[PDB]
Amino acid sequence: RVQLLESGAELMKPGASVQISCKATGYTFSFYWIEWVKERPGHGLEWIGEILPGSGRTNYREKFKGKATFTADTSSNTAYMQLSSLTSEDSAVYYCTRGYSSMDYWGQGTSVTVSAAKTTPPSVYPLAPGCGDTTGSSVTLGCLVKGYFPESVTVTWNSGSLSSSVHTFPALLQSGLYTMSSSVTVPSSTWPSQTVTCSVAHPASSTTVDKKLEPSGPI
Amino acid sequence: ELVMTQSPLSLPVSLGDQASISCRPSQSLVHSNGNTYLHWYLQKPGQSPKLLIYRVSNRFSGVPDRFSGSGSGTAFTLKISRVEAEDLGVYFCSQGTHVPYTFGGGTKLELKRADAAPTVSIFPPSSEQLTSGGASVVCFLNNFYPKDINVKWKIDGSERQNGVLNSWTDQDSKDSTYSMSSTLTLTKDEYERHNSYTCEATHKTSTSPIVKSFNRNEC
Ligand SMILES: O=S(=O)(O)CCNC(CO)(CO)CO
């Protein structure tokens, strides 16, 4: 019943410093190392370093010396990593893990997102056919949900009554703002004769936006 | 440092099949102390990694008996005797012999199905978006298999690479297909300097790209 419990998601401005914690339970803290690992989209896993609590001993990956600092408090059984001079390259999920003869137990991970953006609701743009094309027997519609902060929107297509047919494309952070998209495919008998709507909720701005899908030009 | 070359990148299987995954470090992993710190992990979407095998061949507590590891020198192998649904996800190896510790790039164990060509849908910028001076052109490439796909944008027949955002879904639980969304963002000004906008999808199911296009003048 070894458990490593990390601190919560962080939203940080560039140039700031953040401290992530890792509270160890279920074993003797000074007996194992704590490892720190970085999980960045499009990169895989990158080891930052390790600390042996109570011993004064650390090993850092060279490029993190000067950037990451590990401490460990044997009174509270908590390990900490400080990352300074935060940049866009630091947006990632960070894990702590136990180490000694394998990374045998991992924390749940802490998301750090680096951005100058304020809470910004998304712009929601309809994606519907036009351009004088002839619709087939099925039509694909979409909504582009662009320029929001921070994460998590939900797109619902008319209340949920699809039996999807719906694809949700994971958001990407670019230049400090998120963008995602969502598509649905409907029979041509249903659209544009009947209403198709995308409902986009962004709890962090307490906003919900509904866009009715209409042809973008002659069909 | 020690590079961990893991193969294959993608391992399609039918449930019940054997699976084998290879990790080749760029040098020996035998520590001065005699131990070989080569380990295997499984990570499921939105979960932390979990240990499977430690020090080459030792099965971690709670790990199913169908997992085993073996190997020596610069060739190590994780074997799954019969793939079950709980085994799908991303596998990686780690070495803990040489600082900095390093990880393999991952192997996605996924479900094998018949190849499927993408359904490709292109959309010009929303009137709503152009009003704000922005212009995002969207291409959905839906319900294809295998996952490997490449999207190329052309503007008036010329390839364009910067300002492109791509997002992929994980394998569909019902279809076993993949989908992807590609978004080309330009300024409204730039968008108006050109007519023909094209997304081209290169995928196993064609020796030639599936091309979708429109001309701004007619949309
Ligand atoms: O195998 S791991 O759990 O990734 C760390 C092993 N570290 C040691 C450090 O001296 C071997 O190099 C053993 O404790």
Structural domain boundaries in chain A: 1-116, 117-219
Q: What letters, b where the CB count within 10 A reaches 16 and e where it falls short, cover B1-25? A: ebebebeeeebbbeeeeebebbbbb
Q: Rounded to an integer, what distance in angstroms lies between the CA atom of residue B200 and that of residue B161?
A: 13
* CATH hierarchy code of domain A117-219: 2.60.40.10
- B206: exposed, middle or buried (C-beta count within 10 Å: 0-12, 13-18, 19+)? exposed
* CATH hierarchy code of domain B1-113: 2.60.40.10
Q: Which residues of A touch B37 (CB under 8 A)?
A: 101-102
Asked if B34 and B97 touch (Cβ cutoff 8 Å), the reply is no
Q: Does B219 touch chain A (CB under 8 A)?
A: yes
Q: What is the dihedral of CA A179, A127, A205, A156, to 10 degrees?
A: -110
The region that residue B131 occupies, defined by phi over 0 for left and psi between -120 and 50 for alpha, beta otherwise, is alpha
Resolution (A): 1.7
CATH class of B114-216: mainly beta
Q: How was this model experimentally determined? A: X-ray
Nearest ligand 1 atom to alpha carbon B55: 1
Chain breaks in chain A (C to N over 2.5 A) after: none
Enumerate long-range contacts of A62-69, CB under 8 Å, 24 or more apart.
A62/B100, A68/A36
Q: Rounded to an integer, what distance in angstroms lies between the CA atom of residue B90 and that of residue B19?
A: 13
Which residues are A118's β-sheet partners?
Answer: none
Residue of B nearest to A60 (CA): B100
Task: Give yes or no on whether B1-113 and B114-216 have one common fold.
Answer: yes
Give the 3-state secondary structure of residue B176: coil
Task: Give yes or no on whether A1-116 and A117-219 have one common fold.
Answer: yes
Asked if B183 and A179 touch (Cβ cutoff 8 Å), the reply is yes
CB within 8 A of B136, min separation 6: which ones? A125, A144, A146, B125, B126, B129, B183, B184, B185, B186
Q: Which of residues 165-194 of B touch A (CB under 8 A)?
A: 165, 167-169, 179-181, 183
Q: Which residues of A touch B124 (CB under 8 A)?
A: 130-131, 216
Give the 3-state secondary structure of residue A31: helix
Task: Please give the structure tokens belonging to residue B161.
Answer: 């690479």
Asked if A119 and A150 touch (Cβ cutoff 8 Å), the reply is yes
Sequence spans of domains, chain B: 1-113, 114-216
Beta strand B4-7 with B107-111 is unpaired
Asked if A172 and A179 touch (Cβ cutoff 8 Å), the reply is yes
Q: Which of 3.40.30.10, 3.50.50.60, 3.40.1350.10, 2.60.40.10 would CATH assign to domain A1-116?
A: 2.60.40.10
